[PDB]
């Protein structure tokens, strides 16, 4: 196993929160949330800079892992809208396909319901929420990844691809999609 795979499953393996419903004030490329258990320091590095004002903002969930640097509670992206009233179902279901290839002969395809909980999602979500399912059922990052991926493809038929030998790229882990649009996701190990 590659220093680089250790790497990867380092990475995503790491703890994740899920917080909603927050002001977050933003200064310079920096968004600072407060809750009764801890602050977290946003970086802004993509085209979300564009859309986070100056100064307070309402009303924002946040999608936090953080980053490795002492004593940093800083994350990247995951920012998104609060949704605009409470689900209590699920927003959307939607079909997640993994295909596994082992040795030279055998397909293998899971195929089960990933529920989505909120209208608005960040990349960064997906990306490390479906990575952490596939190294908890899947075996993700027990052996070199290659040329694995994941692609999520919307109603319209728009989709977005994590290629899973490399991290996902910050600039992309401030983009946000519509949650009830996702049709299904598909991944091919
Ligand atoms: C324009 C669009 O909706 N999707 C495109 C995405 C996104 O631009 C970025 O992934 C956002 O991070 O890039 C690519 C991909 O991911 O496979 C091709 C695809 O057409
Ligand atoms: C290689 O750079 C980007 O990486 C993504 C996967 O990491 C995805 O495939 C992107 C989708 O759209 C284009 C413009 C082809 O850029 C791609
Ligand atoms: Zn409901």
Known sequence: RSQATQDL???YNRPYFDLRNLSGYREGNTVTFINHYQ???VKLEGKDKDK????????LDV???REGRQADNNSIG???KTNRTQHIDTVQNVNLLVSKST???????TSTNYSIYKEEISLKELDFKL???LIDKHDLYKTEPKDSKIRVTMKNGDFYTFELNKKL???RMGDVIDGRNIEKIEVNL
């Open 103 to 109: 040795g030279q002969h055998t397909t293998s395809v």
């Open 169 to 171: 790229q910050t600039h």
């Open 131 to 133: 990575r952490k399912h």
């Open 39 to 41: 602050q977290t320091d």
């Open 9 to 11: 499953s380092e990475y």
């Open 78 to 80: 995951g920012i998104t």
């Open 63 to 65: 999608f936090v892992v």
């Open 52 to 59: 986070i004002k100056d100064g307070n903002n309402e009303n």
